[PDB]
Each structure stands twice: as structure tokens, then as C-alpha cells.
């Protein structure tokens, strides 16, 4: 389906909320939500949120000068092929809160400063009904 | 018809999201969402979100020492009788962002210090499905 890419020219502040509503295809493998620091290829990523249906896992990480940081994995997979989903990604001064459904799924401490974030990206095996930045 | 009242023993910070999902009765006059700083009757209100189906308006305000403050009004009423709704109240360093539907509605700029808030209440003419604090 069409992916999402949107600029955040001033960055984001504690209280920024990214809301993604969609539907994991019935034969999906994996999709992702990126908060990048530029339009450049493989740019630094303050957050990489990667639900993996094929391997039954959800990986969190950051990227800096082309090398990945230490992965963090959440408890379980709050996604199912063929089911719709609602994701909130909430920026605090300490980290990102990943809310799936009606419960917080994981908390990802910042590695890159918030003010360096300048681009949001949503793609993969995912059908998107709405992407909003509040 | 049941009202929601839950304590925030650790308070709220920037990056906190208050999600409310419910339905407005077909005979509703008003319902309210309050962020109070204690369980006192007539406690100080850092925020008071008051949709009104009878006078067709949405009022924001703050209470301090029993006295209401300056009233702020949103553009229109994104609520209807006999219709479901979703409301996001997002706390940041500057104020509270009120989102209704899938669109930013209004921004209430802080009056009380955010650290005062220790309690959440939802009452009035409203039928609640979920009230989550992320
Ligand atoms: O961490 C984000 C990236 O992970 C890469 O895959 C990891 C894999 O998760 C890990 O288990 C091991 O196999 O090494 C790989 C990288 O070192 C993904 O390929 C990449 O797309 C990101 O998701
Ligand atoms: O909204 C704060 C309080 O307003 C009270 O009614 C106000 C009214 O909104 C205002 O237009 C003016 O006429 O003074 C009235 C009395 O303060 C509500 O009765 C109260 O519940 C609060 O909502």
C-alpha cells in the first residue's frame, strides 16, 4: 500500500503524539515506523519501530552514522495479520512510549536528542488509514 | 452513566496522553473532563473541558481558590447527541492539546503548574467506554 513520509521541520517536543491507524495485511511479513533526522539515504534514526509478523517479535532500535544501536524487544506481538490496529507513539523528555491498543506496550529511552528528529516514515507490509501528528 | 474518577498519585508530566472514548446520550446537556489537584470538593482545576450540547459550545477553564478563570471556547462543537466520540488530551511543556475525531481542536495554555494535577475525573451526561492514561 502507499507508504507515509512527512517532514517535521522543527523537530518534536515532549507531548508530540504520532497516531497510526491501519490494518496488517493477512500475509504480511513486517512493517516499520521511523523517526529520522534527515531526508538523506539511511539517515540517522532516533527511533526504529519494527513489528515483525514473520518472526513474532517487535524490535526497537536507533541508528547513528550507519550503524545500529543495541536492540530492545517488547513483550509479545500486539499485532495480528488481517486485523486492524491503532498505535500511539508519544514523545516525553525521557523517551518514546509505544501504545498499542489500549495499553502501553513498551518504553524506549532516547539515544538521539529529540530536536534532531526531522522526518517520519511509515512503510512495509502495512495498510494505512490515517497518520496524524499532534 | 457511571462517572470516572481515578487518582494520579505520581502526577502528570509532559508527554502524557489522556484518551477518552464514549458516547453522548441523546438527551445530553453537558459532560466534563477535569484535571484537579486533590480529592477536595471544588478542588482547584488545572483544566476543565466542558462540552455543552444545550448551549452548543465547548468551554475550557481553570479554577483557583474556588474562583473560575477566563473561559476559552473552541471552534464549534465536535460532539453530537447519540453519537460516539474519541477525545485526546495531551500534556506538553506549554499546555494541553485537545484532539477530537482525527483533528486537533484547541490548545489550552497552562495556568496552574502541571505538577499540581493529581487526579482525573470524567462525569456529566456521558456514557464512557474507556478512559486510559498513557
Ligand atoms: O535493529 C534494527 C535492525 O535489525 C536488523 O536485523 C537484526 C536482527 O534483528 C538481529 O536479530 C540480528 O540478526 O542482526 C540484525 C542486524 O544486526 C534488520 O535487518 C534491520 O532492518 C533493522 O530492523
Ligand atoms: O465553564 C466554567 C463554568 O461555567 C459555568 O457557567 C458559566 C458560563 O459558562 C459562563 O458563560 C458565565 O455565564 O458564568 C457561568 C457561571 O460561572 C458552569 O455552570 C460551570 O459548571 C463551569 O462549567
Amino acid at each position: 500500500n502507499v507508504p507515509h513520509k512527512s517532514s517535521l521541520p522543527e523537530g518534536i517536543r515532549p507531548g508530540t503524539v504520532l497516531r497510526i491507524a491501519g490494518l496488517v495485511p493477512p500475509n504480511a511479513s513486517r512493517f516499520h515506523v521511523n523517526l529520522l533526522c534527515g531526508e538523506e539515504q539511511g539517515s540517522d534514526a532516533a527511533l526504529h519501530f519494527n513489528p515483525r509478523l514473520d518472526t513474532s517479535e517487535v524490535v526497537f532500535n536507533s541508528k547513528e552514522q550507519g550503524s545500529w544501536g543495541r536492540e530492545e524487544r517488547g513483550p509479545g506481538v500486539p499485532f495480528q495479520r488481517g486485523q486492524p490496529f491503532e498505535v500511539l507513539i508519544i514523545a516525553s523528555d525521557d523517551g518514546f512510549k509505544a501504545v498499542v491498543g489500549d495499553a502501553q506496550y513498551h518504553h524506549f529511552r532516547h539515544r538521539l536528542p529529540l530536536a534532531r528528529v526531522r522526518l517520519v516514515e511509515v512503510g512495509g507490509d502495512v495498510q494505512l488509514d490515517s497518520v496524524r501528528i499532534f
Side-chain angles (χ1 to χ4, degrees), chain A:
Chain A
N1 197 55
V2 63
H4 180 107
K5 180 178 289 146
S6 178
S7 300
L8 294 163
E10 294 81 358
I12 59 175
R13 298 203 284 211
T16 306
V17 180
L18 170 66
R19 183 186 186 280
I20 307 176
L23 185 138
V24 175
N27 61 336
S29 178
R30 54 184 60 181
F31 74 97
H32 62 263
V33 181
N34 293 327
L35 291 181
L36 306 172
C37 303
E39 100 171 78
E40 295 85 357
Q41 61 275 330
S43 178
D44 281 10
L47 171 68
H48 168 66
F49 171 78
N50 186 219
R52 295 173 188 183
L53 290 307
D54 51 7
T55 50
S56 292
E57 77 196 342
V58 185
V59 169
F60 295 64
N61 204 352
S62 58
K63 192 142 91 178
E64 307 197 51
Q65 301 309 96
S67 299
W68 291 104
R70 286 159 65 189
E71 290 177 330
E72 299 174 16
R73 239 167 299 255
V77 192
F79 302 95
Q80 295 85 0
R81 297 164 158 156
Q83 296 299 337
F85 67 85
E86 216 176 275
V87 173
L88 295 172
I89 298 157
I90 303 158
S92 70
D93 181 65
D94 301 304
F96 294 104
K97 301 184 284 167
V99 178
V100 182
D102 300 292
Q104 186 158 324
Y105 174 56
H106 186 72
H107 176 275
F108 186 84
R109 287 198 181 286
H110 299 307
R111 295 123 177 235
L112 290 70
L114 271 185
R116 287 198 51 212
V117 168
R118 259 107 189 192
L119 202 62
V120 63
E121 200 171 294
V122 187
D125 296 341
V126 63
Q127 180 202 100
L128 295 162
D129 299 348
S130 74
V131 182
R132 296 286 293 172
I133 295 97
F134 302 119

